[PDB]
Amino acid sequence: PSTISEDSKVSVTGLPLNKGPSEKIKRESLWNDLKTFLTENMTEESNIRSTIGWNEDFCSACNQSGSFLCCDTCPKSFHFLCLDPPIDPNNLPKGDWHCNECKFKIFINNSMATLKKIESNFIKQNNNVKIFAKLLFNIDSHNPKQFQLPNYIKETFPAVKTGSRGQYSDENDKSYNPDTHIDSNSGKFLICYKCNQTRLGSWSHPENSRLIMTCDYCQTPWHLDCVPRASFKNLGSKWKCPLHSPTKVYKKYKVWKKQRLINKKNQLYYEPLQKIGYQNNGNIQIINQDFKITQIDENSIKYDFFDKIYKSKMVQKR
Amino acid sequence: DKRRVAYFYDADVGNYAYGAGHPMKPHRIRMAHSLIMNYGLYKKMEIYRAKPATKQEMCQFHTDEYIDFLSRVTPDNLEMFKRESVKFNVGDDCPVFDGLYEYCSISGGGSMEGAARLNRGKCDVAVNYAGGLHHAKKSEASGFCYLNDIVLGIIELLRYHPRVLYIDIDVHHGDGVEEAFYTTDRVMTCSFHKYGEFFPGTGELRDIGVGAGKNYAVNVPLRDGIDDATYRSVFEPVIKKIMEWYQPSAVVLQCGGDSLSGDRLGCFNLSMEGHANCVNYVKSFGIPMMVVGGGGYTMRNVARTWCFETGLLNNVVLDKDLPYNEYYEYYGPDYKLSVRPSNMFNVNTPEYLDKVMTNIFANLENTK
Amino acid sequence: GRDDMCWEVLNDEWVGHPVWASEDSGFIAHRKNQYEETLFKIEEERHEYDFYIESNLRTIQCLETIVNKIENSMTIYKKVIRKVYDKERGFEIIDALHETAPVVLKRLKQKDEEWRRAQREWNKVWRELEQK
Amino acid sequence: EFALGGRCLAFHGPLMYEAKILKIWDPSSKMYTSIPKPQKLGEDESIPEEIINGKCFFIHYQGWKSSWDEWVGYDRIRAYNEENIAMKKRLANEAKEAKKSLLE
Ligand SMILES: [Zn+2]
Ligand SMILES: [Zn+2]
Numbered sequence: 011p012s013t014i015s016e017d018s019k020v021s022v023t024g025l026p027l028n029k030g031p032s033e034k035i036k037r038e039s040l041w042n043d044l045k046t047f048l049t050e051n052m053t054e055e056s057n058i059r060s061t062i063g064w065n066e067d068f069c070s071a072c073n074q075s076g077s078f079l080c081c082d083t084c085p086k087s088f089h090f091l092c093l094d095p096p097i098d099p100n101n102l103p104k105g106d107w108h109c110n111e112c113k114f115k116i117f118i119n120n121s122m123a124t125l126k127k128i129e130s131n132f133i134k135q136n137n138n139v140k141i142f143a144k145l146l147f148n149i150d151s152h153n154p155k156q157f158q159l160p161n162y163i164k165e166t167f168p169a170v171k172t173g174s175r176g177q178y179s180d181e182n183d184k185s186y187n188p189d190t191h192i193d194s195n196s197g198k199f200l201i202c203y204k205c206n207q208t209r210l211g212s213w214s215h216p217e218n219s220r221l222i223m224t225c226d227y228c229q230t231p232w233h234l235d236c237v238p239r240a241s242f243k244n245l246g247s248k249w250k251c252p253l254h255s256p257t258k259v260y261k262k263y264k265v266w267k268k269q270r271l272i273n274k275k276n277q278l279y280y281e282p283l284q285k286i287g288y289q290n291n292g293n294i295q296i297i298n299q300d301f302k303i304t305q306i307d308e309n310s311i312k313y314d315f316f317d318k319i320y321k322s323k324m325v326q327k328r
Numbered sequence: 329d330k331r332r333v334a335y336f337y338d339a340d341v342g343n344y345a346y347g348a349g350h351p352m353k354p355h356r357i358r359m360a361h362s363l364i365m366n367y368g369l370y371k372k373m374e375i376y377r378a379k380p381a382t383k384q385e386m387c388q389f390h391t392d393e394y395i396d397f398l399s400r401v402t403p404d405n406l407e408m409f410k411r412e413s414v415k416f417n418v419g420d421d422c423p424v425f426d427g428l429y430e431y432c433s434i435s436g437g438g439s440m441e442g443a444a445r446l447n448r449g450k451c452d453v454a455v456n457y458a459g460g461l462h463h464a465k466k467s468e469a470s471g472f473c474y475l476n477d478i479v480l481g482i483i484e485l486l487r488y489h490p491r492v493l494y495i496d497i498d499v500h501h502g503d504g505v506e507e508a509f510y511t512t513d514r515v516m517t518c519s520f521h522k523y524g525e526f527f528p529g530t531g532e533l534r535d536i537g538v539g540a541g542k543n544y545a546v547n548v549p550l551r552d553g554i555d556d557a558t559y560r561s562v563f564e565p566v567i568k569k570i571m572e573w574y575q576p577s578a579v580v581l582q583c584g585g586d587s588l589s590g591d592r593l594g595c596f597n598l599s600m601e602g603h604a605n606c607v608n609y610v611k612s613f614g615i616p617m618m619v620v621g622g623g624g625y626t627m628r629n630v631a632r633t634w635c636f637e638t639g640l641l642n643n644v645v646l647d648k649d650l651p652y653n654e655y656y657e658y659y660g661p662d663y664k665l666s667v668r669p670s671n672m673f674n675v676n677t678p679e680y681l682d683k684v685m686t687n688i689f690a691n692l693e694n695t696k
Numbered sequence: 697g698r699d700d701m702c703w704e705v706l707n708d709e710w711v712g713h714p715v716w717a718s719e720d721s722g723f724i725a726h727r728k729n730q731y732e733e734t735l736f737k738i739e740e741e742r743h744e745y746d747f748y749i750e751s752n753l754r755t756i757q758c759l760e761t762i763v764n765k766i767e768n769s770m771t772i773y774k775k776v777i778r779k780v781y782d783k784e785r786g787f788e789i790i791d792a793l794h795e796t797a798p799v800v801l802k803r804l805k806q807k808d809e810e811w812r813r814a815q816r817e818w819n820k821v822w823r824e825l826e827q828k
Numbered sequence: 829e830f831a832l833g834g835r836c837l838a839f840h841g842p843l844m845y846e847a848k849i850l851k852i853w854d855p856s857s858k859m860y861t862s863i864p865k866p867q868k869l870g871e872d873e874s875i876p877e878e879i880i881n882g883k884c885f886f887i888h889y890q891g892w893k894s895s896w897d898e899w900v901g902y903d904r905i906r907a908y909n910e911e912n913i914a915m916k917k918r919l920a921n922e923a924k925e926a927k928k929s930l931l932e
């Protein structure tokens with residue numbers, strides 16, 4: 011055939027690459043030792059290598075978008091992994107696929123005979139385990155679903171929240187700017203704990219100001235230079251200054267963790283009586299019966315520290 | 329120095345384009361080549377065209393499934409390739425184009441041949457800007473990188489050298505390369521990069537290495553828009569200490585244009601001579617060099633940068649006037665050979681840098 | 697292809713996967729002025745023009761070395777032929793060549809001429825825009 | 829719990845109404861602190877004598893108009909915690925049960 015009539019369609023320039031100036035752009039974008047041909051010869055093919063000789067937009071189980079094996083009998087959408095059993099998309103069933111509920115509604119669900127089926131299943135399990143017989147029968151009628159906590163274990167802890175698709179989320183999720191050094195509610199400067207300064211520099215000399223992050227937990231101002239840090243914490247977790255408890259200890263191994271935040275309805279505060287020697291966890295209070303927080307009687311902290319240092323001395327002294 | 333400099337270039341590297349808006353174009357290699365040639369430098373280097381690598385050589389570090397998927401995937405056959413696309417991160421960030429396999433083979437062959445030539449002693453200076461994909465790590469395309477031929481280069485150099493040192497100056501951390509040698513003590517990876525909410529995100533200061541690679545990995549966290557006078561000051565003492573202490577036999581340097589002033593994605597304030605300072609300091613120690621080309625998405629700038637560096641390695645200083653290359657239009661109003669830094673404020677305070685020096689040197693105090 | 701020394705020096709236990717290091721939030725890019733964006737647009741248009749021209753020129757030279765032989769690096773030519781014969785007839789014509797070389801070569805040369813003319817006009821426009 | 833601008837939950841009969849604090853009373857100085865604050869009792873501001881000498885607070889009921897601002901002391905203004913929310917829900921459920929008994 012003669013030529014490609016649909017030759018010049020479009021290019022990055024917007025023009026079909028075969029028109030040129032685009033006069034509107036002309037008015038917009040205007041005012042009013044040899045060559046490389048010798049490289050064919052001085053290029054030597056080097057192969058001296060040592061190895062040269064070698065319906066819905068969400069899954070009906072995960073409630074998320076993605077690969078969907080939708081149905082026709084019931085307008086449902088499932089992820090291929092979010093299916094029981096998990097089916098490989100490579101070897102497609104290539105046929106009519108119905109959900110488990112659709113299968114039960116078609117094969118079994120005669121409006122009255124379903125009682126006959128459940129009765130038969132119960133009487134094939136009444137002699138055997140029958141407490142689970144009803145559940146064992148009924149779970150065969152349900153579509154697979156992603157496992158989620160039962161809406162009350164989470165509520166047992168008032169420090170956790172569910173993310174967008176269902177993820178875990180907690181209390182740590184989160185040119186020249188001299189205003190960053192101003193409290194703006196008391197008019198005071200941000201005296202960093204480490205440097206004891208704000209280091210505002212000046213507008214005339216911006217190269218003397220020092221950046222501050224003002225820790226996201228106890229609001230303590232800190233220089234980026236007082237503690238080594240390259241940039242602010244803006245996208246990730248909430249920044250916390252090093253004036254906070256570890257809440258987790260690896261000792262040589264052995265792991266220690268602090269208990270979680272529970273509702274004060276179920277919180278059982280307790281106070282000891284010895285006040286000098288009382289082995290407690292890190293769950294202390296400075297002033298189901300398993301999460302008792304000790305009221306530590308602060309002077310007891312001093313005492314316990316003192317004889318502890320004494321024992322650390324006598325272990326190596328005697 | 330007066331080093332015998334070999335050079336590698338395939339004339340097919342400028343004929344493989346990424347997506348239309350994609351910042352990764354290897355055409356920059358081709359006008360960099362033209363900048364090298366029209367300056368009369370072709371009489372000072374040994375030009376070669378290395379053989380493209382084969383699957384058996386990429387499987388040295390990469391995986392058989394990964395390489396196999398690479399050799400068969402095509403924009404035409406993409407729609408049936410769905411599991412591997414997500415599995416190996418070969419989707420949008422690292423797109424699939426017409427000659428992806430050819431380009432990867434060319435880059436790997438060039439770098440692997442450069443390491444081979446360094447091993448045999450044909451040259452003490454091997455240069456391959458086509459390679460330098462320091463982001464992909466053995467199973468996945470990352471940072472527009474698909475094949476980490478750099479690790480193949482270090483593999484071949486280690487075949488001859490007891491110790492090989494890797495330096496990364498790309499504003500992006502050398503994630504794939506440092507991961508490839510996080511546990512071994514033969515190779516030190518030393519990456520100068522921007523640390524923050526940046527695409528690498530890795531390269532933390534306390535990343536000295538795990539296992540036997542403990543204290544054998546250096547990460548330099550930096551803030552925005554460092555300039556020549558500060559980049560050289562943070563560069564030279566650490567390189568001095570590493571050379572004096574780790575004392576590598578071979579050494580590899582990644583020369584990415586991403587840290588250039590006014591890079592399409594870069595945020596550093598390095599001019600031409602600030603960048604060339606690192607190359608001069610590295611060549612100031614005498615050990616064999618295998619120069620690659622990494623980041624950089626302003627081809628008019630990286631071409632000039634690479635031409636100046638190849639002039640510098642041959643111990644000559646090129647003219648500031650252009651030799652009238654073919655792609656003359658690319659080189660701005662004055663058509664000079666330089667990168668002009670901008671007026672932005674450099675935030676790298678000396679105290680943070682000093683703490684960085686203290687930490688790095690204290691860690692290195694145990695690497696006789 | 698992993699040799700024993702490769703098994704020795706490599707590392708497959710510890711991986712970072714920056715998404716894990718990014719807290720799955722994302723990455724903060726850099727701020728660029730509109731002038732920089734216009735420079736990027738001009739650079740992109742230049743790169744597209746030059747890439748098309750170079751691919752066409754390489755295929756033209758290869759077709760010349762073929763036709764001068766028949767008078768009596770594996771995907772560039774197929775790609776440029778498909779681009780030129782964008783009517784989906786490139787698939788058949790590539791194999792027809794594999795078994796018509798002068799006509800496709802001369803069509804490529806004509807396309808090269810038009811592309812170079814348009815590139816010169818666009819170079820003028822680009823320079824005029826950039827200079828300010 | 830009890831601060832200027834902070835949330836609070838105050839009793840009102842067999843049910844509670846959540847409010848936001850605006851003024852904090854100091855019986856010792858006969859003074860309240862407000863926010864847009866050392867200042868005497870206002871010319872139009874006054875507190876009932878059973879809470880003039882106690883730690884009273886000026887609160888605004890959320891979901892209610894700005895004309896329903898009330899001076900409530902420590903007697904009804906409770907501490908906003910998990911127990912406070914659970915107990916508000918408890919008396920809301922008891923009000924629901926009373927309504928249902930009035931109906932069914
Ligand atoms: Zn799903
Ligand atoms: Zn169904």
Ligand SMILES: [Zn+2]
Nearest residue numbers: 202205233236
């Ligand atoms: Zn400070």
Ligand SMILES: [Zn+2]
Nearest residue numbers: 225228250251
């Ligand atoms: Zn703090």
Ligand SMILES: [Zn+2]
Nearest residue numbers: 498500586623
């Ligand atoms: Zn880079």
